[PDB]
Design a protein around this ligand. Structure first.
Ligand code: SQD
Ligand code: ZN
Ligand code: ZN
Lengths: 117, 68, 39, 35, 401, 53
């Protein structure tokens, strides 16, 4: 049944299954820290866009949903973030004109080295 | 080129001089039918009763019989 | 499976009449070689 | 070698043959269990 | 499939069991086709991969079939090849223009948009519309500025497009682009070559002979000749492209190239082979059979480093040799290039245009996009001449009234 | 000559299937038949030896 689709699924199954087996066997010989499981949670917490915070707290206080009212809630924040990204890519960010986009995509300005030391 | 072709022509003339078997006795290590020498015979499967018919026409086309 | 068994059992007469024999050598009436005589 | 073995034409042949083989096997199952 | 009845199939213990089980006969037919497919594959692999042992290469040119003309390394050389067509660097952008024109015909990337617009302009009666957008209107005139010009030209959007539709039809009607539903990316290859081989669909309008088959006679005697004499050059270009890509696909591996092409403007033909770089020999070419056909980097490094370093054993004291080798050493012994490098002499032909691009900064506006080229017949200068000429025309038309 | 005149895949598979159906299954049901001794008899013996085997 359309092997041209089965082969990527086969390699994907292999990769993901090997990763899961590895993490399993790795947190057995080394049990995970009972507190830095919160630290990795904080690390992934620091990476979420802002368009989702208006939903996030709403999930803590019950208000949010049953199970699907949520799944259609995340789509709105998602598409808001998506259209913001389209705008930033094409016409620029929130605080930069067209010249700043030109110097961004021409790589005229080095990463600031003097400041970081 | 003449020499290199004369070699082959000499070989062909020698093979011509033989012309057949008259002069060659029978040999028992080399019969004339390779199936005797190789011990080949049919089994139990692959033998249909409708095969002999086509067999015959093969025979008829090998011996030259033009009837078919 | 079963379906085929039926077909074989339908032909069980055309196959071969050779019945293997399970002979005994510790049987009570099993005949040794030279227990028969006049031969 | 693999670029020649997994060419699109050969891929579609393998697909068709696998489909027909699955069909015949499941039909054997169906006619066998209903007996 | 009920074929093994008859009387021609008695005598095999297995055909009778298939007489009573048609599933067995189906399995038998499937297997009897699959085994033959597998045999075909085996033999195809053998015939594909076996001739690779019998290929031998010339040992002087190493299978290139072509050596260098050293004089042309440092009224030209009469010994080495002839130039190619894409060597004339003054005709590059014109050739690219023709090619992109011919390519815009076949291009079916924007197919769905053209299709929906064609269906909208054919029916024009369904009108499954919805609520029109809240329209802001363009600025009134007498406000000079750039934003005003942008908005004003943007709002005159429907009458201009209407004039465009009135002059040129929908592209599918003028045959300017390929047909409506000739090709489908998911149908099959056979159906698509059938549809394209139907009525000169593989040819653009400019070369389609039906467009011209009606009038050609004493007047010029050329239109039907200068079209079959262009379609020929077109097809020659296409076949040459196929040949080049087969050469590249052979060279992607380390195989020798199938098409031997004549030498070019810097190279001469090898004189051991005639230029036929390799061949077949009935002798198995052990270097391939044991995998020793590549030369171990360190060896090549050593050979080259010893080739580029000629050694002098004699001393110019004993042998009264005062000058290095060569001829006319005496004349050889007699500005700010060191500060700002040398001047590149392959780009003089653009100088003029560059100067224009400095006298008229307004030409760098993001709204304009000229064709492209360098001569007074291309791109920038065409737009500039047009602008000056039309402003002069309008100037003269102002005063007469 | 003696290589290209060997039985191809069809005949080899036929041999294997014939031995599976006749070298074990035939003599076994023969033994069952003698232990139990025209389609009615077929059904009878297949049912009986199916049950008690
Ligand atoms: C340790 C103890 C020993 C263990 C042995 C482990 C296996 C060792 C050999 C394996 C690799 C064989 C070889 O190198 O490949 C040479 C051949 C190619 O043939 C060849 O192909 C060559 C061309 S090319 O390489 O394909 O480009 C060509 O040069 C050659 O003549 C032709 O025969 O490659 C293959 O057969 C291997 C294909 C990859 C195997 C995975 C199969 C994937 C499942 C199907 C989907
Ligand atoms: Zn050579
Ligand atoms: Zn030269």
């Amino acid at each position: 049944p359309r092997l041209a689709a089965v082969m990527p699924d086969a390699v994907y199954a292999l990769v993901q299954g090997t990763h899961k087996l590895g993490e399993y066997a790795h947190d057995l010989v080394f049990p995970p820290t009972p507190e830095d499981l919160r630290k990795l949670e904080q690390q992934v917490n620091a990476t979420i866009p802002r368009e989702f915070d208006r939903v996030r707290q709403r999930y803590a206080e019950g208000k949010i949903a049953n199970d699907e009212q949520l799944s259609s809630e995340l789509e709105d924040a998602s598409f808001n973030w998506y259209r913001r990204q389209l705008r930033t890519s094409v016409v620029g960010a929130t605080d930069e004109e067209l010249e700043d986009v030109a110097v961004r995509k021409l790589r005229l300005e080095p990463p600031a080295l003097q400041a970081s030391l | 080129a003449a020499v290199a072709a004369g070699w082959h022509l000499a070989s062909f003339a020698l093979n011509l001089a033989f012309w057949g078997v008259e002069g060659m006795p029978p040999d028992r290590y080399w019969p004339t039918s390779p199936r005797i020498r190789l011990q080949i015979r049919p089994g139990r499967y692959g033998n249909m009763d409708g095969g002999q018919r086509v067999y015959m026409d093969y025979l008829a086309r090998s011996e030259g019989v033009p009837l078919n | 499976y079963r379906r085929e068994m039926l077909h074989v059992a339908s032909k069980l007469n055309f196959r071969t009449p050779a019945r293997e024999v399970r002979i005994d050598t510790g049987s009570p009436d099993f005949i040794k070689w030279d227990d028969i005589n006049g031969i | 070698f693999l670029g020649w073995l997994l060419a699109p034409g050969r891929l579609e042949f393998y697909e068709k043959a696998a489909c027909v083989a699955i069909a015949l096997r499941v039909l054997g199952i169906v006619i066998a269990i209903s007996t | 499939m009920g074929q093994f009845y008859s009387r021609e199939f008695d005598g095999d213990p297995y055909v009778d069991l298939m007489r009573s089980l048609p599933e067995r006969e189906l399995v038998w037919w499937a297997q009897k086709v699959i085994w033959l497919a597998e045999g075909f594959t085996f033999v195809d692999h053998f015939a594909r991969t076996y001739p690779r042992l019998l290929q031998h290469k010339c040992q002087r040119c190493k299978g290139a079939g072509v050596m260098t003309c050293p004089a042309c390394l440092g009224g030209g050389c009469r010994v080495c090849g002839t130039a190619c067509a894409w060597d004339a660097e003054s005709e590059w952008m014109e050739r690219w223009g023709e090619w992109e024109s011919r390519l815009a015909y076949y291009d079916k990337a924007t197919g769905p948009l053209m299709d929906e617009w064609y269906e909208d302009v054919l029916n024009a009666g369904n009108l499954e519309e919805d609520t029109p957008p809240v329209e802001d209107d363009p600025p009134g005139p007498e406000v000079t500025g750039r934003w005003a010009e942008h908005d004003r030209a943007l709002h005159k959007d429907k009458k201009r497009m209407a004039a465009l539709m009135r002059r040129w039809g929908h592209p599918y009607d003028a045959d300017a682009n390929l047909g409506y539903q000739i090709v489908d990316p998911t149908a099959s290859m056979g159906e698509n070559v059938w549809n394209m081989a139907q009525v000169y669909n593989s040819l653009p309008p400019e070369l389609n002979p039906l467009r011209t088959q009606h009038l050609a006679d004493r007047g010029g005697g050329n239109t039907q000749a200068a079209v079959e004499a262009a379609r020929s050059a077109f097809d020659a270009q296409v076949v040459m492209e196929a040949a080049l890509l087969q050469n590249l696909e052979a060279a992607a591996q380390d195989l020798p190239k199938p098409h031997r092409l004549p030498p070019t403007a810097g190279t001469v033909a090898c004189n051991e082979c005639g230029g036929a770089a390799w061949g077949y020999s009935f002798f198995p070419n052990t270097a391939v059979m044991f995998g020793l056909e590549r030369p171990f980097w360190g060896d090549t490094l050593a050979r080259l480093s010893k080739y580029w370093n000629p050694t002098q054993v004699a001393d110019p004291a004993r042998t009264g040799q005062l000058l290095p080798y060569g001829e006319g050493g005496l004349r050889r012994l007699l500005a700010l290039e060191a500060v700002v490098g040398k001047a590149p002499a392959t780009t003089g032909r653009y100088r003029r245009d560059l100067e224009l691009l400095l006298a008229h900064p307004e030409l760098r506006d993001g709204a304009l996009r000229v064709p492209g080229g360098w001569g007074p017949e291309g791109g920038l200068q065409t737009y500039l001449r047009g602008q000056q000429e039309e402003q002069a025309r309008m100037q003269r038309r102002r005063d007469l009234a | 000559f003696s290589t290209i005149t060997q039985p191809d895949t069809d005949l080899i598979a036929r041999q294997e299937k014939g031995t599976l159906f006749w070298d074990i299954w035939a003599d076994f049901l023969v033994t069952a038949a003698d232990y139990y001794n025209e389609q009615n008899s077929l059904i009878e013996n297949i049912s009986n030896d199916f049950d008690n085997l």
